Design a protein around this ligand. Sequence first.
Ligand SMILES: *[C@@H]1O[C@H](CO[C@@H]2O[C@@H](C)[C@@H](O)[C@@H](O)[C@@H]2O)[C@@H](O[C@@H]2O[C@H](CO)[C@@H](O)[C@H](O)[C@H]2NC(C)=O)[C@H](O)[C@H]1NC(C)=O
Ligand SMILES: *[C@@H]1O[C@H](CO[C@@H]2O[C@@H](C)[C@@H](O)[C@@H](O)[C@@H]2O)[C@@H](O[C@@H]2O[C@H](CO)[C@@H](O)[C@H](O)[C@H]2NC(C)=O)[C@H](O)[C@H]1NC(C)=O
Ligand SMILES: *[C@@H]1O[C@H](CO)[C@@H](O[C@@H]2O[C@H](CO)[C@@H](O)[C@H](O)[C@H]2NC(C)=O)[C@H](O)[C@H]1NC(C)=O
Ligand SMILES: *[C@@H]1O[C@H](CO)[C@@H](O[C@@H]2O[C@H](CO)[C@@H](O)[C@H](O)[C@H]2NC(C)=O)[C@H](O)[C@H]1NC(C)=O
Ligand SMILES: *[C@@H]1O[C@H](CO)[C@@H](O)[C@H](O)[C@H]1NC(C)=O
Ligand SMILES: *[C@@H]1O[C@H](CO)[C@@H](O)[C@H](O)[C@H]1NC(C)=O
Ligand SMILES: [Sm+3]
Ligand SMILES: [Sm+3]
Ligand SMILES: [Sm+3]
Ligand SMILES: [Sm+3]
Ligand SMILES: [Sm+3]
Ligand SMILES: [Sm+3]
Ligand SMILES: [Sm+3]
Ligand SMILES: [Sm+3]
Lengths: 409, 409
Amino acid sequence: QPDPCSDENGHPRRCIPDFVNAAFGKDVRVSSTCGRPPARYCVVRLRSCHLCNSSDPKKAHPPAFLTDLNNPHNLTCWQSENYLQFPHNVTLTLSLGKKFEVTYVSLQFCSPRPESMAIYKSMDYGRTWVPFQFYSTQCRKMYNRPHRAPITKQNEQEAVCTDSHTDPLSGGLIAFSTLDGRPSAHDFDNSPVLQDWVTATDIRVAFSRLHTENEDDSELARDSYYYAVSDLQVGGRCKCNGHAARCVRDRDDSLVCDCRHNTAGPECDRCKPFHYDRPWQRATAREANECVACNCNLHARRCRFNMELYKLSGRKSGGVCLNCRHNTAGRHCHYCKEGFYRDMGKPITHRKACKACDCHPVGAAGKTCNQTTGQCPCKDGVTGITCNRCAKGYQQSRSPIAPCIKIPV
Amino acid sequence: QPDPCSDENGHPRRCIPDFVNAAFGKDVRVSSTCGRPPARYCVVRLRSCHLCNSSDPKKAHPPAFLTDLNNPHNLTCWQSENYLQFPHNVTLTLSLGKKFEVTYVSLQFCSPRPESMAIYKSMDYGRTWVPFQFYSTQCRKMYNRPHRAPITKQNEQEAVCTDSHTDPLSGGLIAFSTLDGRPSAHDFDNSPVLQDWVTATDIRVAFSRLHTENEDDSELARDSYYYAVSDLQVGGRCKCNGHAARCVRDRDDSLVCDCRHNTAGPECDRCKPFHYDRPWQRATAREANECVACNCNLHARRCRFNMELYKLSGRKSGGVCLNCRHNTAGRHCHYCKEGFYRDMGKPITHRKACKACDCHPVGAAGKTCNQTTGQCPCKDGVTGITCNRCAKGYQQSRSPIAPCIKIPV
Ligand SMILES: *[C@@H]1O[C@H](CO[C@@H]2O[C@@H](C)[C@@H](O)[C@@H](O)[C@@H]2O)[C@@H](O[C@@H]2O[C@H](CO)[C@@H](O)[C@H](O)[C@H]2NC(C)=O)[C@H](O)[C@H]1NC(C)=O
Ligand SMILES: *[C@@H]1O[C@H](CO[C@@H]2O[C@@H](C)[C@@H](O)[C@@H](O)[C@@H]2O)[C@@H](O[C@@H]2O[C@H](CO)[C@@H](O)[C@H](O)[C@H]2NC(C)=O)[C@H](O)[C@H]1NC(C)=O
Ligand SMILES: *[C@@H]1O[C@H](CO)[C@@H](O[C@@H]2O[C@H](CO)[C@@H](O)[C@H](O)[C@H]2NC(C)=O)[C@H](O)[C@H]1NC(C)=O
Ligand SMILES: *[C@@H]1O[C@H](CO)[C@@H](O[C@@H]2O[C@H](CO)[C@@H](O)[C@H](O)[C@H]2NC(C)=O)[C@H](O)[C@H]1NC(C)=O
Ligand SMILES: *[C@@H]1O[C@H](CO)[C@@H](O)[C@H](O)[C@H]1NC(C)=O
Ligand SMILES: *[C@@H]1O[C@H](CO)[C@@H](O)[C@H](O)[C@H]1NC(C)=O
Ligand SMILES: [Sm+3]
Ligand SMILES: [Sm+3]
Ligand SMILES: [Sm+3]
Ligand SMILES: [Sm+3]
Ligand SMILES: [Sm+3]
Ligand SMILES: [Sm+3]
Ligand SMILES: [Sm+3]
Ligand SMILES: [Sm+3]
């Protein structure tokens, strides 16, 4: 069970959390639940009505039932409140509290499937919602949607209406594939819009009309106007952009990717401090697109990225250093500032590879060193890096203006 | 009659003024002169006394007579006042008002030569005097001097006493050679002390006892106790140290060498402004020892000499420049100061052969040029003297930190 982000040889490798039913176990918020106050429900010569009493445990159908274990034997099932009018839309809302890549959303009913329902998603933690899938026989009437609309390479963030659900009365499932039907699911791994389509922080499914005049017209309701669902599932992985092997509870229970590849953020959607030599790209299966640290030769704490710099190279590197501290300067603090010179004995990384100009006042003709070698501008007859000694064939005078005069012969 | 200081080829040549009788024509100052009031003088069986009357022109003997033309015929002669006691010293003082190199001092008497006289000189324009020559029979008694003292190579600034004058009564000369007798007159041209010995700004000759008991003891005087001199001469040249062809009247009649060889002063005893590359030596017959101008490549008005500098070379040059003005510096203002660089197009002498560092702010890694070539410290990929253009194989970025990034291939 090795590190999935760490390739063999300690290298980077794209990594994504286990695929899960994110709904499982989690508490779902339903607009209507039978049992409060207790009331009998007929179950349709099929009329065998039983009691839904919320208090009475063995005869209750709470929303908890929606998500717990479902085995055909001793199966368990939530049930909406009864005698629904027509205008109704009964809603189940699920809040993951983290961005997810959802592959499917599936419900299994104990009641007959709705004639109209609609799946929604929140990308924004519950403030606004988006059409995900529509199900109805009368598409244009109920949801104002073309029936079985086509999905071009454009307009493939389209939430379609379909009669697929209409096929049953004793129960049965209706499941929604997010990727199915889209043209660009060939290579989702590098699809910018399908990677956005399959993202949700909350999920909401809203039944809006039941499967019913022959007896008595179309108006008032009866014991059998209710919905029941046994198992809700949203299948998908935690949204980590491939830079994390799992999600996990942060400080203060805000579930978040355990980020890797020198990425940070809740979705690993960015690079980690001082790791800005390369732009944050989402990890594909080909290149793990980790965040490589800029290089400052140990003379800068902070760092910055320039995209031109990246583009101007072979898309190799674009990092930049800030306030080079040890009398260094340059993009990478690579060279020694004016007024100093590269101490060649120390290595550039060393705190003190930049040494100062204690050049000779009389000897040298200037104050500033060569910024590599240290050589000061020697007066005509003086030699040395400091210009602190007369060339051979010259004699030291007491004069500051000119020491080291020519001996002739 | 060409320039004697200017050798053929316009070169330097030692030059000295015409040799002269400096006393000639000049007014002499005598302590005693007969004629005021008129009195008869006996001239010694020789007693043929005539009249000295200062007013009476044809019978006067003023000091003017001492120096004017002297031809044996119609000769002319000054005469001291008469009836001199013994203590007397009668003095003739001559003031040249300029330093001279005197070869001889000669007097010709109409009276009998003194038994004691003494020649003196002033080197200091009349304040103090120095023994030059002594003449007496009683040397130790009169002048307190050894008779015919010898003249070593040392102690050859000695003023000797001699009986040379004693050999006559009707007249006759007594002349004094300054150089005669000295050992170092072989090469006076390069003798430091004989060149000093023969120097005088004033000359004074003092008769102190006459050439007389057989008749009447030794006490009171008679008509014939007087001195008379016909021609006084001091022979010599104007003291120019060989750097001037003649002396001549300055502003305000202060006679002075017309100095040459880039020398100045009254005696040409020094070098002329900004001509201090070589110490002032007196011109010998071998080397004219002119004053060579120091070199400042036209960037300094003033200049100075260092003797160490001269000694440190092959006694070649020792000049130094002051406040190099055109952003130059150095002994000769030879190089360009820091913050500038030698404009190689102009010649060093040009006002503007020092050009400034308008180096590139982004391109170059420093503010200061090479002080010869101008090259600034180029950042890694930039080329140019200003570092104002990217090297080939590099692409200009908008970044100040690093423009001119590597194109790879
Ligand atoms: C069911 O849904 C829509 C609205 O969706 C939600 O309904 C509730 C379950 C609750 O979640 C609300 O916050 C949502 O608005 C119903 O009709 C719409 O709701 C607005 C309420 O602001 C109402 O004014 C309009 O009739 C509708 N607005 C828009 C923009 O369409 C409706 O009852 C059901 N929908 C269908 C298609 O039957
Ligand atoms: C003649 O000379 C000396 C002094 O020389 C000068 O005498 C005058 C002509 C006048 O020029 C003075 O200014 C000079 O001093 C006579 O004796 C000396 O003179 C000083 C006077 O200050 C006197 O006190 C001393 O006797 C002498 N001083 C010294 C230092 O010797 C003297 O009359 C004559 N000399 C001889 C040798 O006979
Ligand atoms: C430091 O010295 C270097 C090396 O001399 C300077 O750059 C060189 O100048 C020579 C001059 O002959 C050229 O031949 C080289 O091509 C240059 N090499 C480079 C620019 O890498 C440089 O200008 C000096 N810099 C400082 C700050 O003194
Ligand atoms: C100006 O540049 C010169 C020439 O590069 C510097 O002196 C030379 O440095 C090189 C380095 O490779 C040596 O090989 C030469 O021997 C040096 N020549 C000299 C000293 O004459 C000099 O230090 C620089 N001066 C300034 C003011 O920038
Ligand atoms: C529902 O069950 C609770 C708990 O036993 C009880 O209080 C209530 O009476 C029941 N209601 C009916 C209608 O049986
Ligand atoms: C000297 O000459 C002047 C001018 O002739 C005269 O005044 C004076 O009397 C003369 N003295 C004697 C003593 O002859
Ligand atoms: Sm590998
Ligand atoms: Sm696993
Ligand atoms: Sm269940
Ligand atoms: Sm009926
Ligand atoms: Sm010649
Ligand atoms: Sm001549
Ligand atoms: Sm005469
Ligand atoms: Sm007698």
